[PDB]
Design a protein around this nucleic acid. Structure first.
Ligand SMILES: Cc1cn([C@H]2C[C@H](N=[N+]=[N-])[C@@H](COP(=O)(O)OP(=O)(O)OP(=O)(O)OP(=O)(O)OC[C@H]3O[C@@H](n4cnc5c(N)ncnc54)[C@H](O)[C@@H]3O)O2)c(=O)[nH]c1=O
Ligand SMILES: [Mg+2]
Ligand SMILES: [Mg+2]
Lengths: 560, 425
DNA sequence: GCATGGCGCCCGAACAGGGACTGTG
DNA sequence: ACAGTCCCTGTTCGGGCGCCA
């Protein structure tokens, strides 16, 4: 039976007409499937045969189902969708087991031919016209036109979900105490009644739907502890991902690496420490899904260590609102971070990782801060609150930071945990000049046409140096200078410069970078004991600044 | 007895807003769902489907002295697309008055707007979607059927009414100036605080007789005083002795300053660093040097020339983190042509949470702008997009929301806007 | 020669903005 | 004294994959 629920009004974008794309070559064998199906949807009144006047059409096709025991008709309304009004999607996120609370009784149902049970706006039906070929392709098959939500349309998912919510509204009102998670047509109903009483409600519901056209086949979990839901196994007290099967092969293609990392990342949900960093580098730069990329050293190793983790399966524990949450993070590797949120020490509620490296030059504090924020958000989405943080960073370290960094910054309630490695700033620039230390005035310059460059320094103790540079940028030189000044520097040095660019990078105390040079500058700074970089308006004839310039900009701005 | 509506012609080639909803907290949602059930009951809003292609985010807030949650829509983007409507067809005029008054109070009169019905056509654009915790269910969508709290177009419509409601009050009190900017009413007078508050209490009353509600507080000063507002500019440090480092830095500021005021001269001071010396090395300021310095120090007193406000341009606000819980900001329309410049101190009855402070600071700057130009500035916030987008709502306390923008640019100019002048005692 | 919506991750291209040279006036 | 250009960095948006339906 179709549904008695009001259809949602849909329209095509202004000035545009229906689709008139022809039916493409189909498997004679496959065709069978569709012809079978269309004969059913016909008597069921879900679709309708149509006359000659209808000029629209859209290629259709089948695809194996979950158990490959049947087939799901799909339509290629790709051309229709572009000519169709926009919809605001009502699906905001995805449920998560770790956000689920315990309930004495539970059940989960699904809707047989779900889309196919929600009436499709009448006047829009015209365009949903398609054509089924004859078993032998002698003469035109039967032209059909959907009367219900057709798979492969912008509107179907959102229409249904919205209409499926309207259906559950009454029922929800009457039984405030029942919990119903609805993802599409997938229903998870959990309560604190007794097994039998439960079944009752479930009968109401299952029937309630039936009055609305939402048929409910007996392929819905009833009295089973292992509940198959949203890709997980839901147990009375615990849960976990469903069997996760990493691919096993000698050589790999680009696409193969994707399928891999995507699998591994989906496992990061609960399997702590999973890393895909290196594996991901393999797909750097334009490539092609087919191209056969080779697993480097790391990757081979990573995939391995990462493979030894999926050995001993893990489980997650459900959510208890009766006690605040805890999220702990640790520094995985350079750039990489992993975390886990729990309520009881060993019982991890859920795990994850944060590797995204944002920026050219940063450090650990800032990245650490990023994860905090990343988790905070993710936590509000699942539980609605922000958890307490256990961070491997000195309370003193951080205070220094936020009280010295020029940008506003903050971390919620958090406590220090001495679980190595530990985050810390690797050096600090002196606030005031150091007495009795070589004062390096540094600069550099370059020709934006020859790309040649001189980066030089000159000190008060009369020492001096300039180096020539093949193809550089007016910026890099200024950088080089400071490098030179730091190399040839002592253990306590003063460095004045006119380069904000340079000065800028250094002042944020970086401990990582994509810039070769900077890492060198970095390294050199750690080794130092008391550094102090100063700034001075370029071309203003100040102290030694004036001189270095004269030097470094020797043969790049003389004459034209 | 029917009740009319004003059609809201949207600007040509203007598409409505389509903003995704940002995840709210346990309480925020709870409270928001409740606020929405009633509003839907009182017919303020109605449930919509996905056939409507528009959206705007919403959230909730709990104000000072208040323990009731207030719905808050971010029509910021709708406001932008509906500007010609409220800035041209029907625009609330800004009186230069309260800028001058000795005391201004702000009333949340906004609730009035629910009283008038919103045009049917423009309604599609007021859509909003309430999220659900851990995504139990697909977001519920609603749209307003009455002027909504937060759209600049609402105060534009009610203008007709509000004025009438006030003609009496404005008659008996010919000195009090009242400005209506969005959901608020700025009431300013020269009276004494005690009498002022009273006149306010009378205004609240006056409003009640005309059915308008003004949320009341749990009552545990508050009101703004456009007098203690002082534009304070740059100050060259003054010390007994001087080192190269010092003179350099000084030339720093001065040089940067020469951008604001063109009078600054650096010539003589530059001479002091004539030649490559050590930093800690001490230097005595010469006769011509000392003059120039003081000569300059004088210039920094008279504000620039050409700082004339111009309604046809946007208003830009910049905040500098000075630390120690101290903050500084400048508001301008064209670079180096500051229209104002102040600071921001510590929290009373609260803590030192870096972010929260900016949040408070930003709001501070905004009202001052409202009071002074009856426009909101575009803020250049000194904090990472995420850090901010993570907690600004958690500390926000105003019905309006400014148009912010993020930026990072350290004190390369070495503390160009803070305390420097401190000689020996 | 094979579709839709939603979220996640990773990658890189496209576009934006801001300081600093450069040339012409 | 003001565009025109270059370097560098940050943000958004699109493609692929994973997972759900
Ligand atoms: C995965 C996927 C989903 N979807 C959209 C469209 C689809 N809605 N519909 N129709 C909705 C729900 O997905 P679901 O995975 O539940 O598929 P659907 O609801 O289409 O069929 P379902 O999977 O529920 O059906 P089965 O699990 O294969 O079989 C259930 C059994 O019940 C009996 N049964 C079902 N209907 C009837 C009936 N009318 N009369 C008698 N017996 C019936 C029958 O014996 C069958 O074996 O998501 C999509 O567009 N593409 C996809 O790739
Ligand atoms: Mg189904
Ligand atoms: Mg230079």
């Amino acid at each position: 039976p179709i549904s008695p629920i009001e259809t949602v009004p849909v329209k095509l974008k202004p000035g545009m007409d229906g689709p008139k794309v022809k039916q493409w070559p189909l498997t004679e064998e496959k065709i069978k499937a569709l012809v079978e199906i269309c004969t059913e949807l016909e008597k069921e009144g879900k679709i309708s045969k149509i006359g000659p006047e209808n000029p629209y059409n859209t290629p259709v096709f089948a695809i194996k189902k979950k158990n490959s025991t049947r087939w799901r008709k799909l339509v290629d309304f790709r051309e229709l969708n572009k000519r169709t009004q926009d919809f605001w999607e009502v699906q905001l996120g995805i449920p998560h087991p770790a956000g689920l609370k315990k309930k004495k009784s539970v059940t989960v149902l699904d809707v047989g031919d779900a889309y196919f049970s929600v009436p499709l706006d009448e006047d829009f039906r015209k365009y949903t016209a398609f054509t089924i070929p004859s078993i032998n392709n002698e003469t035109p098959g039967i032209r059909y036109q959907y009367n219900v939500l057709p798979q492969g349309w912008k509107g179907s998912p959102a229409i249904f979900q919205s209409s499926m919510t309207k259906i559950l509204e009454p029922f929800k009102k009457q039984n405030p105490d029942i919990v119903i998670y609805q993802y599409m047509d997938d229903l998870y109903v959990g309560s604190d009644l007794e097994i039998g009483q439960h079944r009752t409600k479930i009968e109401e519901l299952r029937q309630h739907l039936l009055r609305w056209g939402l048929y409910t086949p007996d392929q819905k979990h009833q009295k089973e502890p292992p509940f198959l839901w949203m890709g997980y196994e839901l147990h009375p007290d615990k849960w976990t991902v469903q069997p996760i099967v990493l691919p096993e092969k000698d050589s790999w293609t680009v696409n193969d690496i994707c399928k891999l990392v995507g699998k591994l990342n989906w496992a990061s949900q609960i399997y702590p420490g999973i890393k895909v960093r290196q594996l991901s580098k393999l797909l750097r730069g334009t490539k092609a899904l087919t191209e056969v990329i080779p697993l480097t050293e790391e990757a081979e190793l990573e995939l391995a260590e990462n493979r030894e983790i999926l050995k001993e399966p893990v489980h997650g524990v459900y959510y208890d609102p009766s006690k605040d949450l805890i999220a702990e993070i640790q520094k995985q590797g350079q750039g990489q971070w992993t975390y886990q949120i729990y309520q009881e020490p060993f019982k991890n509620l859920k795990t994850g990782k944060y590797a995204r490296m944002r920026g050219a030059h940063t450090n650990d504090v800032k990245q650490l801060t990023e994860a905090v924020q990343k988790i905070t958000t993710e936590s509000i989405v699942i539980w609605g609150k922000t958890p307490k943080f256990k961070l491997p960073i000195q309370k003193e370290t951080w205070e220094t930071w936020w009280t010295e960094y020029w940008q506003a910054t903050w971390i919620p309630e958090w406590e220090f945990v001495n679980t190595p490695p530990l985050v810390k700033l690797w050096y600090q620039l002196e606030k005031e000049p150091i007495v009795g230390a070589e004062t390096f005035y540094v600069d550099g310059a370059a020709n934006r046409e020859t790309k040649l460059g001189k980066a030089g320094y000159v000190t008060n103790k009369g020492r001096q140096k300039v180096v020539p540079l093949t193809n550089t940028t007016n910026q890099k030189t200024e950088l080089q200078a400071i490098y030179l000044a730091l190399q040839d520097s002592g253990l306590e040095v003063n460095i004045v410069t006119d380069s904000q660019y340079a000065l800028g990078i250094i002042q944020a105390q970086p401990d990582k970078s994509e810039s070769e040079l900077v890492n060198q500058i970095i390294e050199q700074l750690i080794k130092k004991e008391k550094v102090y970089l100063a700034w001075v308006p370029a071309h203003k004839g100040i102290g030694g600044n004036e001189q270095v310039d004269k030097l470094v900009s020797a043969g790049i701005r003389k004459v034209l | 007895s029917p009740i009319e509506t004003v059609p809201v012609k949207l600007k040509p080639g203007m598409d409505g807003p389509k903003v995704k909803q940002w995840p709210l907290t346990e309480e925020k949602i709870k409270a928001l769902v409740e606020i929405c059930t009633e509003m839907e009951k009182e017919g303020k809003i109605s449930k919509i489907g996905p056939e409507n292609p528009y959206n705007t985010p919403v959230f909730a807030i709990k104000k000072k002295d208040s323990t009731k949650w207030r719905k808050l829509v971010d029509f910021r983007e709708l406001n932008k697309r509906t500007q010609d409507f409220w800035e041209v067809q029907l625009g609330i005029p800004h009186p230069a008055g309260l800028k001058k008054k000795k005391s201004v109070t702000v009333l949340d009169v906004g609730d009035a707007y629910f009283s008038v019905p919103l045009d049917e056509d423009f309604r599609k654009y007021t859509a909003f979607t309430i999220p659900s915790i851990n995504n139990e269910t697909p977001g519920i969508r609603y749209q307003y059927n009455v002027l909504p709290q937060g759209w600049k177009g609402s105060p534009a419509i009610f203008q007709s009414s509000m004025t009438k409601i006030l003609e009496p009050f404005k008659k008996q009190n010919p000195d009090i100036v009242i400005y209506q900017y969005m959901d608020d009413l700025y009431v300013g007078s020269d009276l004494e605080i005690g009498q002022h508050r009273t006149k306010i209490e009378e205004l609240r009353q006056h409003l009640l007789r005309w059915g308008l509600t003004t949320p009341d507080k749990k009552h545990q000063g508050y009101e703004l005083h456009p007098d203690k507002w002082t534009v304070q500019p740059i100050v060259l440090p003054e010390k007994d002795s001087w080192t190269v480092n010092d003179i350099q830095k000084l030339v720093g500021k001065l040089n940067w300053a020469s951008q604001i005021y063109p009078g600054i001269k650096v010539r003589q001071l530059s001479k002091l660093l004539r030649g490559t010396k050590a930093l800690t090395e001490v230097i005595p300021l010469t006769e011509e040097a000392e003059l120039e310095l003081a000569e300059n120090r004088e210039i920094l007193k008279e504000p620039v020339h050409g700082v004339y406000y111009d309604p046809s341009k946007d208003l830009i606000a910049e905040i500098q983190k000075q630390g120690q819980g101290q903050w500084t900001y400048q508001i301008y329309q064209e670079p180096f042509k500051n229209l104002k410049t102040g600071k921001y101190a510590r929290m009373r009855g609260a803590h030192t949470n870096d972010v929260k402070q900016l949040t408070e600071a930003v709001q501070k700057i905004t009202t001052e702008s409202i009071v002074i130009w009856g426009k909101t500035p575009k803020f250049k916030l000194p904090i990472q997009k995420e850090t901010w987008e993570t907690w600004w709502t958690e500390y926000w306390q105003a019905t309006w929301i400014p148009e912010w923008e993020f930026v990072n640019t350290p004190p390369l100019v070495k503390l160009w806007y803070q305390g420097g002048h401190h000689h020996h005692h």
